[PDB]
Design a protein around this ligand. Structure first.
Ligand SMILES: CCCCCCCCCCCCCCCCCC(=O)OC[C@H](COP(=O)([O-])OCC(O)COP(=O)([O-])OC[C@@H](COC(=O)CCCCCCCCCCCCCCCCC)OC(=O)CCCCCCCCCCCCCCCCC)OC(=O)CCCCCCCCCCCCCCCCC
Ligand SMILES: CCCCCCCCCCCCCCCCCC(=O)OC[C@H](COP(=O)([O-])OCC(O)COP(=O)([O-])OC[C@@H](COC(=O)CCCCCCCCCCCCCCCCC)OC(=O)CCCCCCCCCCCCCCCCC)OC(=O)CCCCCCCCCCCCCCCCC
Ligand code: BCL
Ligand code: BCL
Ligand code: BCL
Ligand code: BCL
Ligand SMILES: CC[C@H]1c2cc3[nH]c4c(c3C)C(=O)[C@H](C(=O)OC)c4c3nc(cc4[nH]c(cc(n2)[C@@H]1C)c(C(C)=O)c4C)[C@@H](C)[C@@H]3CCC(=O)OC/C=C(\C)CCC[C@H](C)CCC[C@H](C)CCCC(C)C
Ligand SMILES: CCCCCC/C=C\CCCCCCCCCC(=O)O[C@H](COC(=O)CCCCCCCCCCCCCCC)COP(=O)(O)OC[C@@H](O)CO
Ligand SMILES: COC(C)(C)C/C=C/C(C)=C/C=C/C(C)=C/C=C/C(C)=C/C=C\C=C(C)\C=C\C=C(C)\C=C\C=C(C)\C=C\CC(C)(C)OC
Ligand SMILES: [Ca+2]
Ligand SMILES: [Ca+2]
Ligand SMILES: [Ca+2]
Ligand SMILES: [Ca+2]
Ligand SMILES: [Ca+2]
Ligand SMILES: [Ca+2]
Ligand SMILES: [Ca+2]
Ligand SMILES: [Ca+2]
Ligand SMILES: [Fe+3]
Lengths: 57, 318, 255, 42, 280, 54, 55, 55, 38, 42, 57, 43, 57, 54
């Protein structure tokens, strides 16, 4: 249910600064989520899957 | 490259300024002013003249007596041996009376000299306070310096006088000596269970750091706009110039807000004054109210907890 | 007996109350210049809405000037002053671009307020900042070179002129400006000490701020024997404009 | 007015604002339902 | 919003990196290239600090995890990891946050350089801020590097880092005798006196006694000549204050840099070179 | 009924940017708070613990 | 009182609103944190069950 | 007094109102915390029940 | 603001505040039934 | 005469101020009665 | 035993600043004395009178 | 006389490229999580 | 499934400035990703593969 | 094919100096990384321990 005049948001919010804000936030957010996930049981690098490489050698 | 306005490259000279005339009742100033070329590289080349009325004369007399009583006892403590006095200078001190004497006047041979040095330095400082007040009065200036000085005197008074009396013993005051007064500082923290956990110690640190923060900011800011006469803060305050405008915008653009040429000196004034206000309160509460700051911090839920990787059997329990 | 509340805890809370009151006090003092703020909310509200933040502005204080100089009030209503620039983009938060030749635009680091058209005074009431020709009691400190007669060079090493006199602070003795007789037009213009490096062995004053040819347009003094606050700021701002405007490389960026 | 918006401009922004806010709250309710179904916390 | 005199200074250009791409303000803040970069380092570092608080030292379910403001602590790795990267949950989180902080700090200073370029003012403030950055980097980079492990860095916890300071200090028995530490403290103390002296004098001459006009430069010089027989001058007091504050920071860095890398015994015993001189 | 007139008092742009900033911060805060607790869905070994496989 | 409306001739309506919103949001966060610091904590009460025990 | 109203000729009503409001909120927050640090604490008193035990 | 403008704001402000207080009351009744605290 | 308000405006502001403050004090009294019934502290 | 011309003190000291200062001084003194009294035997909040409410639960 | 300087047509034009570009980004996000859910389901 | 007028992004962001920002971001991202991976079981420097060279001496 | 046009928009001289400064740091960085691992070639006592010769 998007409003027909939602495009008018760019009459209030500046494109370049909005674009910069989105890119910056998402990079920070993507880096954060990876480091959150890595610091849990969901960790995909040290799970010795498919094999452990410090054990193998 | 550019001129950084750190050193005066070309000094000029004019006949020495005798000072703004003072009202009747003030004594004439004394001294023939001289010029130091090398002081003139970093600041004002004129040394002197000086004002010295009864207040400052009495202050200096008390202060010279106090300083000499200290030095005499230092020299006596290496048996007049001047070479050993120089060898051990940083270690020597004039020691407070033993605890057995309480707040009573102790013997000349065992603490009387400390109490006399403490009395006369204290009176010397109090008279110096009056001097700062009178010199502003004679110039028609407000009393900001003497108010800030009173805050420092408060802290000084708490360390050596108020707390020892509250604790009933001159033995709890500070010895006069370089390294000896450092012993006192460390021992005080040990005795009272780690001064890091005293919240007024934490505040005093915040304000001491802030003073260096604020003077670095302000010192650097003014030199960067001194090309616009920004060091002339009186007329920048009454008649805002591009110096004061550019300074505020540098900080507004950096951290989102800014002050004025006048009001930075209020931030600076309060930051410096609160350093010694909180310090006095922190010491005033140590021994009198809180005996172990760590356990006080534990009690109010502040002390960090760590995984146990070392531990020791208490042989007093066994 | 035992109690959770103790005097150390009471006192530290009392400090926070004092401290936050102090912070609001200080923030009020901070708003005696530059406020209320120029916003696009005040434009569209037709002036109904003044942007001042929190806390609000203090009641005005008065500064009484010596020698019957008048009264200054703070905060004060200041008339809007036109900006000699046009926006790089119409979007809010965009910089502006100086009109015309940037050196002469009075915009950016070339900008300055309109300070009073009178001279700062000594305690005794004389013009504070004056050339050594007028304050004949001044001399150069022994050991340092006399700047008079030194050659003034611009940022590109070209000869801009000669030091024709030295302007000193009579209240607190120091050089504040060098007087430069500009070769190109034979006009005498002030040069702030803040923009001057001495090369003592060469007897040259180097000015990195502007080119030699830029000295022709240093703002001129209405009266050659004194300097008004107004003229002091216009002079200093013109040199400062060169820091950003005097060459193309100075616009940036590095990469 | 204090915002510069006309009376008709405030009705228009309000209609889009309220429409967008209700939509956002609808997403919030859906998320708390899924979270309640997967892991009830009360 | 802008200061009522600000618009005439909002000039285009003067960037070091970025040019027109990021050359804009966000409310009062100037952004620019180092504004964008610094914001990312900062938000990441802050959010990773909060994540470390969320999981605590041994997982979010343990009794050691806490959001108590004094007790939150993110700690560096064990010394056994040397100069390598530890696992995120074993100090690596601290290691990433440190790099964010350094990047956040250095980006802040370079942004300041761009602001100075816009305003045509001197570069003293970012230059002075570099001393604080250097001290942070001495603490987390140079000194750990010279001793061989990032774990010599201090932990990021409001009270836990005071425990670090305490235990590092007492490794030298009586840290008060560190000569660079004594010198640095003298600068810290002298700076505070000088700051109160400067603040007082400016407020007292611009706010004189009732009925008095604003006082003059002659009053300022006379006033301290009357008290101490010397006046340094209104420009030089700002020179002095910057020198004292920067000297305090510099000798701080020196005093911790020599504690471990260039001295391992008690600090009082250092003074035995003095005591053992063949004069006495 | 005249609640739309709120946009004659409060700036619509300023309200929007404030809501976005507040909501992102509050949203991040709540995830972290819930993750500090028993409700944690990342470290619950549900549906299984993947480190116990290696 | 009948003339209570005249308070908006004294206090800026725009500012009062903004102050209420800011105060209430901070107060709401404060009260939750206080309650969560107490026995009343509804997040770590293992009610209806401990989900970490389920794993 | 019958002319006590003349206090609004010496004190700014706008400033006095805001100061009272600010004072009352701070006092209210301060007093609640004081009472929470005494025997009168009503949140962690396990009355009517301790919710951490019942779960 | 004019006198008529102040009455209009006051009428809308009071209904909005009582409505907000209504949600506050509902939240506490829900909270009281789930977890009575006195 | 020193704050700007007329003598009538001060009588009118005082009247509303006193009724407002008495109303606030009434709310304060009600809360302390409820507090005394639930948890008498003296 | 009061003077008749004592009202002339308000020709010497600013009445606005006197009233404000009195209000400030009284509010602070009141906070201080309560905490002084709280830190003595007269303490009325944590005295378990009429009863201890923590011991009640 | 808009606040951003954009005309009405430009806002429409920017909005259409912005919406299309954001959906593509979110689409990649959905694919990443589908792959992640297939590889390592976390609920 | 791109937008045929995606090139118009260079009418909003200065293209020469975006290049410098991308290159320095990528260098710092590469540094971060190596460090993170080096903190894990996938570590290729300390895995004693093919052999441990400290055990040779 | 038009990659040389990069030097019409980025000043060649500072690109060079950035590369030189970057390379020297990276070189120091990589050595200190290598040295802090099993590949360390200074304290591996290969071909011999010169200290043990004492
Ligand atoms: C045991 C002690 C031993 C001490 C030994 C000392 C030895 C010397 C002894 C002799 C002492 C003589 C004292 C002076 C004599 C008379 C001087 C004089 O000329 O008077 C006329 C003097 C001048 O009149 P004027 O017309 O104002 O002239 C001013 C000029 O025009 C120019 O004025 P201006 O425009 O610059 O303005 C002046 C300035 C005024 O500043 C000062 O002058 C004094 C500076 C303070 C110095 C003391 C430090 C205070 C420490 C407090 C922290 C303690 C922690 C606990 C907190 C408790 C408080 C709650 O304005 C401000 O800075 C405003 C400050 C606002 C205060 C903080 C704001 C918040 C307050 C609370 C807010 C509400 C709370 C709840 C809020 C809720 C929401 C958050 O009268 C004054 O108004 C100024 C008063 C200052 C003089 C007395 C106070 C300072 C001197 C004593 C300091 C002692 C320090 C020791 C502290 C101990 C620890 C607690
Ligand atoms: C509260 C702040 C929010 C106020 C507000 O409504 O702002 C909206 C305002 C817009 O409203 P507007 O329509 O322009 O209205 C004009 C304002 O009313 C303009 O009104 P204004 O100029 O009245 O407002 C200024 C306001 C706005 O300022 C800001 O935007 C930045 C705010 C940063 C606050 C920092 C506080 C630090 C506290 C640290 C915690 C420790 C406290 C102390 C602990 C004990 C220490 C002793 O800043 C403040 O009010 C706080 C300044 C005072 C802080 C005092 C801290 C003292 C600490 C102790 C020091 C020791 C003193 C010794 C004596 O500004 C913004 O939207 C900011 C946009 C955010 C941009 C973020 C991204 C920036 C990217 C580049 C940077 C990368 C990083
Ligand atoms: C078990 C867990 C899974 C896993 C689960 C997920 C999931 C689930 C997701 C990711 C996502 C990402 N993962 Mg992962 N991830 C795993 C392991 C890894 C590892 C690793 C070392 O192990 C790495 C390096 C990555 C890397 C990444 C990124 C490619 C991506 C986040 C990009 C981002 O935030 O952009 C920040 C965003 C922006 C900048 C905005 C969008 C950019 C658009 C395309 C256009 C911008 C161009 C603009 C003009 C210029 C930009 C340059 C600027 C100058 C800076 N994954 C493992 C195997 N990963 C996300 C993803 O792929 O997103 C689609 C995602 O949803
Ligand atoms: C068991 C507990 C659940 C859980 C319970 C909830 C609940 C309950 C909610 C969320 C919500 C959110 N969760 Mg969660 N969440 C879980 C796991 C995760 C994980 C993870 C790594 O495991 C992540 C990254 C997230 C991330 C998020 C966000 C997508 C969203 C908050 C956005 C916000 O703050 O808006 C602030 C920003 C704005 C208001 C800006 C304006 C709107 C813009 C234009 C759109 C932004 C994107 C939007 C959120 C689309 C996502 C909707 C999806 C249906 C989730 N959840 C677990 C599995 N999560 C919230 C949500 O979806 O709200 C609707 C919410 O209420
Ligand atoms: C047993 C204890 C209960 C509990 C007891 C209470 C009580 C009691 C109250 C709240 C209130 C609220 N709680 Mg709680 N709360 C619980 C758990 C949570 C959790 C969580 C992670 O578990 C969260 C995030 C919240 C969040 C919230 C907010 C939605 C709300 C306060 C917002 C505010 O301050 O507005 C400040 C903002 C403004 C004044 C802005 C202007 C108003 C605008 C127009 C309305 C905004 C949206 C509105 C708040 C939506 C919800 C009302 C419904 C009744 C839910 N609750 C637990 C389960 N919660 C309060 C509330 O709902 O008030 C009505 C309240 O009084
Ligand atoms: C045993 C101890 C009691 C207790 C003892 C008391 C006592 C006794 C009093 C309060 C009062 C208050 N308590 Mg309590 N309080 C308890 C538990 C709580 C808890 C909680 C999480 O448990 C909360 C959030 C509160 C919250 C509050 C506020 C509603 C109120 C303070 C407002 C104020 O400062 O005004 C400052 C703001 C202003 C002056 C602004 C102007 C007033 C405006 C116009 C009115 C705003 C709405 C108003 C606050 C509505 C409440 C009145 C009702 C009669 C309750 N109480 C426990 C159960 N509480 C006070 C009170 O009700 O005051 C009447 C009071 O005297
Ligand atoms: C060199 C003399 C002194 C000095 C000067 C100095 N500092 C300065 C400046 C100058 C000239 C600035 O221009 C600059 C400024 O803009 O001030 C307003 C700054 C500044 N000095 C600051 C702080 C400060 N300076 C300190 C010290 C000093 N600064 C000196 C003693 C200290 C001390 C002693 O501890 C601190 C707390 C900031 C107010 C500001 C720099 C602001 C900044 O860089 O912002 C970007 C970063 C953030 C907003 C936060 C980043 C968060 C990180 C990514 C995560 C956190 C990691 C951190 C290591 C955790 C620490 C946790 C625990 C230790 C609690
Ligand atoms: C250094 C000594 C400077 C000095 O000694 O200068 C003297 C003046 O002293 C005078 O005013 C008095 C000079 C006293 C001031 C000297 C410096 C004091 C310390 C200043 C530094 C600040 C102190 C710390 C503050 C934080 C020289 O004058 P006379 O001694 O009169 O001799 C000249 C005769 O021929 C007169 O005909
Ligand atoms: C031989 O030497 C000559 C004569 C040539 C001169 C040389 C002097 C020298 C070299 C002196 C060296 C001095 C040094 C190195 C001093 C170092 C001092 C330090 C570091 C002191 C630090 C702190 C001291 C403090 C804080 C002391 C505070 C003491 C107080 C406040 C004591 C107050 C006591 C009072 C008010 C006593 C009152 C007595 C009553 C009234 C109670 O009597 C009943
Ligand atoms: Ca794997
Ligand atoms: Ca001793
Ligand atoms: Ca899971
Ligand atoms: Ca629960
Ligand atoms: Ca209860
Ligand atoms: Ca009782
Ligand atoms: Ca390998
Ligand atoms: Ca080898
Ligand atoms: Fe200054």
């Amino acid at each position: 249910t998007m409003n027909a005049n939602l495009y008018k948001i760019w009459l209030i919010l500046d494109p370049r600064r909005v674009l910069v804000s989105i890119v910056a936030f998402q990079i920070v957010l993507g880096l954060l989520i990876h480091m959150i996930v890595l610091s849990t049981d969901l960790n995909w690098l040290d799970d010795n899957i498919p094999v452990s490489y410090q054990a193998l050698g | 490259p550019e001129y950084q306005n750190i050193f005066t490259a070309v000094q000029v000279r004019a006949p020495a300024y005798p000072g703004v005339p003072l009202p009747k009742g003030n004594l004439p100033r004394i001294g023939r002013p001289i010029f130091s070329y090398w002081l003139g590289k970093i600041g004002d080349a004129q040394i002197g003249p000086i004002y010295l009325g009864l207040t400052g004369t009495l202050s200096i007399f008390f202060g010279l007596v106090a300083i000499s009583i200290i030095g005499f006892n230092m020299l006596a403590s290496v048996h007049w041996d001047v070479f050993q006095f120089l060898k051990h200078f940083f270690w020597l001190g004039l020691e407070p009376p033993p605890p057995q004497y309480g707040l009573r006047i102790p013997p000349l041979s065992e603490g009387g000299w400390w109490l006399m040095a403490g009395l006369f330095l204290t009176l010397s400082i109090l008279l110096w306070w009056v001097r700062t007040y009178k010199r502003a009065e004679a110039l028609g200036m407000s009393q900001h310096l003497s108010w800030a000085f009173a805050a420092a005197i408060f802290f000084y008074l708490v360390l050596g006088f108020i707390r020892p009396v509250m604790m009933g013993s001159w033995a709890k005051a500070v010895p006069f000596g370089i390294f000896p007064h450092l012993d006192w500082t460390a021992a005080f923290s040990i005795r009272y269970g780690n001064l890091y956990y005293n919240p007024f110690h934490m505040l005093s640190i915040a304000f001491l750091y802030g003073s260096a923060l604020l003077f670095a900011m302000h010192g650097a800011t003014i030199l960067s706009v001194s090309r616009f006469g920004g060091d002339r803060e009186i007329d920048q305050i009454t008649h805002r110039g591009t110096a004061a405008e550019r300074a505020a915008l540098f900080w507004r653009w950096t951290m989102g807000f800014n002050v004025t040429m006048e009001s930075i000196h209020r931030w600076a004034w309060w930051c410096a004054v609160l350093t010694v206000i909180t310090a006095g309160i922190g010491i005033l509460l140590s021994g009198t109210v809180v005996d172990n700051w760590y356990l006080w911090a534990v009690k109010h839920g502040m002390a960090p907890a760590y995984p146990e990787v070392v531990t020791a059997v208490n042989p007093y329990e066994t | 007996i035992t109690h959770y509340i103790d005097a150390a805890q009471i006192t530290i809370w009392a400090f926070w109350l004092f401290f936050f009151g102090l912070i609001i006090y200080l923030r009020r003092e901070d708003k005696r210049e530059g406020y209320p703020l120029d916003s696009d909310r005040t434009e569209r509200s037709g002036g109904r809405v003044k942007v001042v933040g929190f806390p609000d502005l203090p009641d005005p204080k008065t500064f009484v000037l010596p020698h019957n100089g008048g009264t200054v009030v703070a905060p004060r209503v200041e008339a809007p002053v036109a900006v000699n620039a046009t926006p790089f983009s119409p979007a809010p938060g965009s910089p502006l671009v100086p009109n015309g030749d940037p050196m002469l635009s009075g915009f950016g680091p070339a900008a300055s307020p309109d300070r009073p058209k009178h001279c700062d005074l000594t305690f005794e009431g004389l013009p504070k900042i004056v050339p050594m020709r007028v304050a004949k009691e001044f001399s150069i400190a022994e050991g340092d070179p006399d700047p008079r007669g030194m050659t003034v060079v611009g940022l590109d090493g070209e000869v801009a002129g000669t030091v024709s006199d030295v302007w000193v602070d009579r209240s607190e003795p120091q050089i504040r400006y060098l007087e430069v007789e500009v070769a190109a037009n034979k006009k005498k213009v002030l040069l702030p000490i803040g923009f001057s490096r001495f090369d003592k062995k060469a007897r040259k004053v180097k000015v990195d701020a502007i080119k030699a040819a830029h000295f022709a347009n240093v703002p001129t003094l209405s009266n050659p024997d004194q300097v008004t606050l107004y003229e002091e700021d216009k002079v200093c701002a013109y040199y400062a404009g060169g820091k950003l405007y005097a060459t193309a490389e100075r616009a940036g960026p590095l990469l | 007015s204090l915002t510069g918006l006309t009376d008709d401009e405030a009705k228009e922004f309000h209609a889009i604002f309220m429409q967008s806010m209700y939509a956002w709250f609808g997403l919030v309710v859906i998320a708390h339902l899924l979270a309640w179904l997967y892991r009830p916390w009360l | 919003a802008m200061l009522s005199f600000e618009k005439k200074y909002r000039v285009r250009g003067g960037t070091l990196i970025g040019g027109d791409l990021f050359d804009f303000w966000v409310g009062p803040f100037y952004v620019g290239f180092f504004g964008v970069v610094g914001f990312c380092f900062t938000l990441l570092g802050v959010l990773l600090i909060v994540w470390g608080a969320t999981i605590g030292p041994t997982g979010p379910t343990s009794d050691l995890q806490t959001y108590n403001l004094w007790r939150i602590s993110i700690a560096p790795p064990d010394l056994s990891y040397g100069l390598r990267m530890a696992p995120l949950t074993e100090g690596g989180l601290w290691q990433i946050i440190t790099i964010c902080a350094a990047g956040a700090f250095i980006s802040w200073a370079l942004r300041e350089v761009e602001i100075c370029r816009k305003l045509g003012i001197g570069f003293h403030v970012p230059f002075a801020f570099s001393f604080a950055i250097g001290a942070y980097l001495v603490l987390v980079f140079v000194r750990p590097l010279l001793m061989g492990a990032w774990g010599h860095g201090f932990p990021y916890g409001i009270l836990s880092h005071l425990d670090w300071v305490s235990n590092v200090g007492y490794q030298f028995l009586h840290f008060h005798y560190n000569p660079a530490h004594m010198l640095a403290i003298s600068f810290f103390f002298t700076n505070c006196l000088a700051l109160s002296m400067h603040g007082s004098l400016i407020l007292s001459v611009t706010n004189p006694q009732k009925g008095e006009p604003v006082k003059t430069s002659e009053h300022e010089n006379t006033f301290f000549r009357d008290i101490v027989g010397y006046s340094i001058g209104a420009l030089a007091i700002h020179r002095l204050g910057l020198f004292l504050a920067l000297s305090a920071a510099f000798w701080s860095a020196v005093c911790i840099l020599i504690s471990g890398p260039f001295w391992t015994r008690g600090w009082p015993e250092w003074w035995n070179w003095w005591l053992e001189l063949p004069l006495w």
